[PDB]
Structure formats: C-alpha cells, structure tokens
Amino acid sequence: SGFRKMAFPSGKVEGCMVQVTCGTTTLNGLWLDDVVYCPRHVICTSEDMLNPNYEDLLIRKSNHNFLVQAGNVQLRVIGHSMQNCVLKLKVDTANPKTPKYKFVRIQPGQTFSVLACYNGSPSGVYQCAMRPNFTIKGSFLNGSCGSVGFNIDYDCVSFCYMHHMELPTGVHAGTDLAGNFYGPFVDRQTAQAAGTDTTITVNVLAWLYAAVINGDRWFLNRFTTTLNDFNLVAMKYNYEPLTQDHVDILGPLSAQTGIAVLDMCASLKELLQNGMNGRTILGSALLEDEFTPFDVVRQCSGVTFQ
Amino acid sequence: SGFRKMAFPSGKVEGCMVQVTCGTTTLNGLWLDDVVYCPRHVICTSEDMLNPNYEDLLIRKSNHNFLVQAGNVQLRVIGHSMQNCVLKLKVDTANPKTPKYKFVRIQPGQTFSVLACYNGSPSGVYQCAMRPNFTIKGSFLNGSCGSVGFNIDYDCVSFCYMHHMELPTGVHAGTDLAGNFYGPFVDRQTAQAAGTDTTITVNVLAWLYAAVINGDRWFLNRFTTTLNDFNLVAMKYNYEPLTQDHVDILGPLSAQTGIAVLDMCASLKELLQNGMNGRTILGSALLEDEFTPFDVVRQCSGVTFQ
Numbered sequence: 001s002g003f004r005k006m007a008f009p010s011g012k013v014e015g016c017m018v019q020v021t022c023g024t025t026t027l028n029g030l031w032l033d034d035v036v037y038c039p040r041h042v043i044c045t046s047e048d049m050l051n052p053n054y055e056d057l058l059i060r061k062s063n064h065n066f067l068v069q070a071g072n073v074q075l076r077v078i079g080h081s082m083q084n085c086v087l088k089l090k091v092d093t094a095n096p097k098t099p100k101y102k103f104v105r106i107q108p109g110q111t112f113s114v115l116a117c118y119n120g121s122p123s124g125v126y127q128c129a130m131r132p133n134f135t136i137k138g139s140f141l142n143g144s145c146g147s148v149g150f151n152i153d154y155d156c157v158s159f160c161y162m163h164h165m166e167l168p169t170g171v172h173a174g175t176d177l178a179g180n181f182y183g184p185f186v187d188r189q190t191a192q193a194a195g196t197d198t199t200i201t202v203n204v205l206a207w208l209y210a211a212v213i214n215g216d217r218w219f220l221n222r223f224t225t226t227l228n229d230f231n232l233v234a235m236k237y238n239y240e241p242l243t244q245d246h247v248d249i250l251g252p253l254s255a256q257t258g259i260a261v262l263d264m265c266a267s268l269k270e271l272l273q274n275g276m277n278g279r280t281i282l283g284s285a286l287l288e289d290e291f292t293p294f295d296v297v298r299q300c301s302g303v304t305f306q
Numbered sequence: 307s308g309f310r311k312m313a314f315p316s317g318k319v320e321g322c323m324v325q326v327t328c329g330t331t332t333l334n335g336l337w338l339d340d341v342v343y344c345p346r347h348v349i350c351t352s353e354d355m356l357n358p359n360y361e362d363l364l365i366r367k368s369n370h371n372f373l374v375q376a377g378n379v380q381l382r383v384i385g386h387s388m389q390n391c392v393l394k395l396k397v398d399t400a401n402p403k404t405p406k407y408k409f410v411r412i413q414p415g416q417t418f419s420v421l422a423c424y425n426g427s428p429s430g431v432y433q434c435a436m437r438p439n440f441t442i443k444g445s446f447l448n449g450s451c452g453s454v455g456f457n458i459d460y461d462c463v464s465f466c467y468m469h470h471m472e473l474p475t476g477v478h479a480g481t482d483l484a485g486n487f488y489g490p491f492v493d494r495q496t497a498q499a500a501g502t503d504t505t506i507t508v509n510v511l512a513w514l515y516a517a518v519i520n521g522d523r524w525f526l527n528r529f530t531t532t533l534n535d536f537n538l539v540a541m542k543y544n545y546e547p548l549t550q551d552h553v554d555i556l557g558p559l560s561a562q563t564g565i566a567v568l569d570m571c572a573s574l575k576e577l578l579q580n581g582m583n584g585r586t587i588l589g590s591a592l593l594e595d596e597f598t599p600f601d602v603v604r605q606c607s608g609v610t611f612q
C-alpha cells in the first residue's frame with residue numbers, strides 16, 4: 001500500500017531528446033525516426049517575439065541555420081516544415097532509440113508525465129494534469145521549451161504535450177505534438193491570461209476511492225445524494241460538474257470498495273461544506289485532483305509496461 | 307517557475323531491472339555487470355517467513371533453483387552468495403546497459419527516487435525521503451521487493467535503497483544495496499514497529515526558500531529568532547533539531563533570496579504556532595519536508611545529467 005504521485009518510467013522518452021539551437025535560442029527537440037519536433041518560436045529573435053510572422057521568418061531560414069545536438073553528435077538537417085506551432089526538422093539519421101509511439105491530444109482533466117529537459121539533457125520527471133482552463137501547473141525554467149509530456153500504455157509512448165511558454169501567474173501553456181495549443185493561447189508575447197480554473201471533480205472522487213483502498217475512512221458517512229443535488233454543491237465550490245459518464249467511469253472503483261459513487265459524492269459534499277477539521281487524506285490537507293480514475297486503478301493494482 | 311515533486315529520469319535504472327523467481331516467490335533484481343542483487347527473503351517459503359535461518363536455507367539451494375528473466379531472456383546463475391540481507395546471484399552475462407554507478411548508504415532526511423517494479427518491469431517513478439525513523443512512505447504492492455531507490459549525479463547512478471517489506475502502518479522498510487537495513491528492522495515476520503516519526507526541519511526551511519524563489523511571500527515577517535529559541539519551538543511541534551550545520555547548508559538559498567536563515571526560522575515558528583489560516587504554500591496546506599536544500603537548488607536552477 002501507500003499512494004504517491006507517480007510518473008511513468010521516462011527511459012523511452014529520454015532516448016529521444018535532442019538539443020536544437022538556432023541563432024541565439026537554444027531549446028529541446030523530440031527525435032522520432034528521422035524528424036526532430038520542436039517549438040516554432042526557436043526561429044524567433046529577442047525582438048521577434050513581439051508579434052512575429054513565422055511564415056515570413058521561416059522562409060528566410062536555411063537548413064544549416066538549425067544546429068541539432070544528439071548528445072555528442074551533429075545531426076544534419078536536410079529539410080524543414082512548419083505544422084501549426086511546431087517545427088519539423090528532417091534529419092539524415094533515424095533515431096535508433098525510437099520507441100513505439102503515438103501522438104494524442106488529451107482532454108482537460110487527463111494526467112501525464114513531464115520529462116523536463118535543458119540543452120537536450122533530462123533534468124527530472126513529474127506528473128501533471130491538463131487543467132480545465134488548459135494550463136498545466138508545471139516546473140519549467142528558461143531553456144525547457146520542447147520538453148514533452150506523455151503517457152505509456154504497455155510498450156507504446158503516447159506523446160500529448162510539448163512545452164512552449166509561461167503565463168504571468170506562474171503556470172504553463174503548450175501544444176500537442178501536432179503543434180495545436182491547448183486552450184486559447186498563442187506563441188507571441190501579447191496579453192493573454194488563463195482565465196478561471198476549476199477543480200476536477202471526477203479526479204477528486206477517484207482519489208477518495210484511493211484513500212479508502214489504502215485505509216483512510218474517516219470521511220465516509222451513511223448519507224447519499226442525487227447527482228443533481230451534488231452538482232448544486234459542486235458549482236458553489238468551483239468544482240466541475242459531474243456527469244453520468246464520470247459516474248460510469250468510477251464504476252470499477254465503486255465496485256472494489258463497496259461504496260456507491262453517489263455515496264462518495266455525499267462524502268465529498270460534507271468535506272466541501274465542513275473542511276477537514278485538522279485531518280489529512282493520503283498525506284494531504286487539501287482535496288487532490290490530479291489523479292484520474294485510471295491512475296488510481298493503475299497504482300492500486302500494479303500495472304507495468306515493457 | 308513552479309515547483310513539483312520531481313524524480314530523477316529513470317532510464318539508467320530501467321535498463322538494470324530483472325525478474326528473479328525461486329520456488330513460489332517472484333520479485334525484482336538489480337543487474338549490474340555480471341551480478342544480480344535481490345532481497346534474500348526470495349529463498350523463503352510461505353511457512354519459512356516466520357523465523358527463518360537464511361544461512362541454513364541458502365546452503366540447501368542450487369544455482370539452478372534461481373530463475374532470472376531479463377525481459378525475454380534467461381540469464382543463467384553460476385554462483386550465489388549472501389551479504390547481510392541481500393543475495394548476490396552471479397550470472398554468465400554482464401549487463402550491457404550497466405550505467406556508471408555507486409552504492410551509498412544515505413542519512414535520514416535525504417531524498418531519493420524510487421522506480422517501482424513488478425515482474426522485472428518498471429511501473430512508475432516517484433520521489434521519497436528516508437524518514438527520521440528510517441521508514442519510507444512508499445507505494446508498494448506484493449511483488450515490488452527488489453525495486454530500488456537512487457539519486458543521479460551527472461552520469462553516475464547512486465543506488466541507496468532496496469525494498470524489502472511493509473510495516474503495519476502502511477510504510478516501508480528496506481536496505482542499502484549492501485543489504486544492511488535502514489533502522490532497527492529485520493527480514494522476518496516478528497513484531498516490529500516504526501516508532502515515532504518527526505518532521506525534517508531543515509527540509510521544511512528549504513521548501514520555504516523554494517516558495518520565496520517562486521513568489522509566495524505571505525508567510526515572511528520582520529521577526530527573528532535565536533537558534534536555541536527556535537529549537538525550543540521545534541521540539542514542541544515534533545520537529546527535528548536544527549543544527550548549525552543545517553544553517554550552513556541553507557547558506558546558498560539564504561544568499562539567493564536575501565532572507566537570513568534565522569529569519570526564515572522566525573517564519574516557520576509563526577507557521578507552527580498559528581497554522582496557515584486557510585492559505586497554501588506551493589500548492590500545499592501542510593508544511594512539506596521531503597525536499598532537501600540540494601533538491602531546491604537543483605530544481606530552481608535547472609541542473610541536468612547525461
């Protein structure tokens with residue numbers, strides 16, 4: 001037992017990270033087969049970042065302008081294209097470490113592992129969620145752009161996020177691996193702001209089931225609630241609405257613990273209305289919302305990957 | 307910016323994990339050069355676990371009793387020895403993925419990354435601390451024994467922990483890679499119990515510096531305190547004593563933020579005495595103690611590894 005914020009093993013992704021340098025900008029790229037993917041603002045300069053016209057900017061570039069370091073080795077660029085906000089550098093060598101992989105665009109509420117990188121070298125791995133307002137609460141310094149987020153499913157890496165920028169609240173915005181931003185954000189330095197976040201209700205319920213699986217029961221009650229009456233309380237506390245579909249997803253966990261979904265909703269309702277009274281759940285004094293129902297079942301049953 | 311519980315990239319360790327099966331027991335082993343390291347209770351049976359005599363148990367074994375899976379391959383055992391509570395299986399193939407590495411026995415308060423494994427296959431990676439009572443608050447199910455904890459320093463993996471058992475409070479006990487248990491624990495099923503844990507004071511102060519680096523300042527004050535008067539408050543709240551040596555270690559962080567160590571102690575004192583008044587620090591409603599001063603400097607400055 002025990003319950004931790006757990007990231008996927010990062011080895012399959014580490015073998016893909018490279019350094020991309022162009023002009024005065026250095027950031028990370030993702031090397032899969034003979035293509036290196038990276039944020040298109042690598043073509044920008046310190047004065048370009050204001051309101052750049054990237055199509056104009058890119059036509060002025062030559063392959064040799066792009067310096068691509070894979071550890072201790074030049075990769076030669078032989079072609080380049082732009083897809084949405086990502087740049088695709090064709091290189092003359094296929095990455096022999098290329099895992100089985102997929103690109104996926106995730107829904108808000110879904111979680112992933114981030115391999116933070118600088119200069120093409122991995123620094124650390126941690127677990128994030130796509131917030132309802134399409135930011136992520138990351139840990140990113142200058143040079144971290146092109147670090148990716150991902151999930152692993154048996155032997156297949158599903159890449160879902162590439163880091164582009166930091167918002168003035170200290171949170172982070174980026175794209176899928178096809179270069180489409182999550183949320184309303186754009187890669188230019190104009191006024192943008194997150195807009196109001198909310199708590200991921202179905203994940204909070206999943207984490208309460210994790211707590212029960214692990215022996216914290218102090219918050220259970222004999223009450224129950226209807227879905228409608230629960231959502232009336234949810235909206236007051238800035239929680240996302242719980243749909244019948246969420247209820248269905250929580251079925252396995254409800255079946256393992258013996259606690260009907262709407263009974264767990266009654267418990268969340270009283271925790272919202274009363275607070276925790278000096279008590280903790282799974283070592284937290286806040287209601288945790290960055291574990292999905294799948295995350296809870298993975299970690300409480302022990303699923304692996306090769 | 308941002309601040310997360312960050313583990314080391316796990317790739318160098320993933321390449322070392324193997325499956326060790328003997329009789330009815332299956333657990334994980336660590337394959338470095340031509341030796342596989344694993345917990346010695348793999349030689350035990352369901353009735354052996356009570357009060358076993360492992361030296362008697364081991365003399366009854368033959369090399370061929372030990373089944374060692376490295377993915378899709380038999381490794382043949384050609385010799386075996388016992389060192390403290392770990393078993394060392396000599397195999398006829400050196401691991402070509404063996405990283406540069408070291409075995410280190412860590413002090414309480416120090417943190418490390420755990421690569422949780424089942425059947426020789428990595429499941430997830432998370433960050434832990436060695437508690438003052440020499441347990442770790444892990445996430446471990448049946449089959450996880452032989453999963454290791456580690457730190458990485460440039461290109462060198464320092465292995466510091468191997469998982470052996472779970473205590474009735476849901477926390478975990480294990481050894482260094484030379485097989486010596488951390489704390490008073492033994493690998494037999496007799497009454498054992500953790501004994502009273504305490505909060506890692508120097509780490510809490512490091513995390514408060516992280517908060518300042520990241521823009522949370524609401525908890526600062528103009529007070530200060532002496533070391534003696536701080537430790538008088540520490541002991542009341544079950545915090546470990548802060549030594550002058552801890553104060554010295556916190557020097558770099560104090561210099562970066564402009565906040566003298568003993569001034570940060572004055573702030574911790576008021577947080578201990580007043581609580582947080584509905585406020586959070588770095589997204590936590592509790593005072594966090596599983597980041598060392600080194601962890602904070604690593605993540606706030608961006609150090610990498612190859």
Ligand SMILES: *[C@H](O)[C@H](C[C@@H]1CCNC1=O)NC(=O)[C@@H]1CC2(CC2)CN1C(=O)[C@@H](NC(=O)NC(C)(C)C)C(C)(C)C
Binds near residue numbers: 049143165167172187
């Ligand atoms: C790439 O490595 C870098 C990562 C940042 C640096 C600090 N933390 C991070 O995550 N990304 C950038 O530097 C990007 C590149 C652009 C688009 C041109 C600017 N940028 C930023 O992150 C900006 N942020 C903004 O300007 N944000 C808006 C426009 C106000 C929303 C800063 C952080 C450099 C100011």
Ligand SMILES: *[C@H](O)[C@H](C[C@@H]1CCNC1=O)NC(=O)[C@@H]1CC2(CC2)CN1C(=O)[C@@H](NC(=O)NC(C)(C)C)C(C)(C)C
Binds near residue numbers: 350447451478495497
């Ligand atoms: C190895 O994979 C396994 C990991 C455990 C299983 C549940 N969570 C874990 O971390 N370790 C064990 O099964 C070890 C092997 C022994 C020494 C023989 C027993 N054991 C345990 O963890 C015991 N725990 C205890 O018996 N603890 C004491 C003696 C009461 C302190 C249990 C969990 C199997 C009961």
